[PDB]
């Protein structure tokens, strides 16, 4: 919308659980799906935002895409991941440090935006992720997760830390047509 100039961190669980066929064919193909849709409508609706796109897999966290406002980059990013098996542990923090990674490069005035696809029951971490939520808060990163079904508590809480005390960003889908519904209204500018 040319008004603000966005960073969005688009954070994809390809973890062991979105091997899961009952989202079809499976969860991480549909999910692909979806953020292609969503990497095509963001792109087109804030043309001067830009975009980088990580993975969650086999307990770490991986760069897929730089941060850039060439969609087709992260289309391109995209389709390499599609071919390719969700595996292994998802870690939220790896994630998360890996966004702070990309995020903190770009000039401040600039919004701070992470969206993390969820599709697992738990993260693996490292370290202590209540510190790296600490690091998040401070240097204003909001974060907002999509969650497939189940409620996982540090998501509430990942969430509602970083929204100052909204806990309205996290959200569950439980089908397509909800996800998709969330990525259009990922396209438009956070609210306050």
Same mark, same amino acid.
């Given at each position: 919308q040319r008004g603000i100039i966005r960073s969005l961190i688009?954070?994809?669980?390809?973890? &062991?659980?979105?091997? &899961?066929?009952?989202?079809?064919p499976n969860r991480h193909a549909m999910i692909i799906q979806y953020a292609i849709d969503f990497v095509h409508e963001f792109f087109d609706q804030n043309p001067?935002?830009?975009?980088?796109?990580?993975?969650?897999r086999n307990g770490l966290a991986q760069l897929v895409s730089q941060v850039s406002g060439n969609p087709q980059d992260h289309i391109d990013a995209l389709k390499s991941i599609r071919k390719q098996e969700p595996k292994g542990n998802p870690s939220l923090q790896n994630a998360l440090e890996m966004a702070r990674?990309?995020?903190?490069?770009?000039?401040?005035?600039c919004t701070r935006e992470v969206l993390i696809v969820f599709g697992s029951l738990s993260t693996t971490d490292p370290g202590d992720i209540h510190q790296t939520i600490d690091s998040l808060v401070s240097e204003k990163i909001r974060?907002?997760?999509?969650?497939?079904?189940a409620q996982v508590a540090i998501c509430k809480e990942l969430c509602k830390a970083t929204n100052y005390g909204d806990e309205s960003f996290?959200?569950?889908?439980?089908? &397509?047509?909800?996800?998709?519904?969330?990525?259009?209204e990922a396209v438009t500018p956070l609210p306050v």
């Open positions: 688009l954070t994809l669980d390809c973890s &062991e659980a979105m091997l &899961e066929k009952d989202l079809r001067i935002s830009q975009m980088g796109i990580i993975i969650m990674g990309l995020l903190l490069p770009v000039p401040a005035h974060v907002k997760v999509l969650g497939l079904s996290y959200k569950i889908l439980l089908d &397509e047509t909800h996800l998709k519904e969330l990525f259009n």
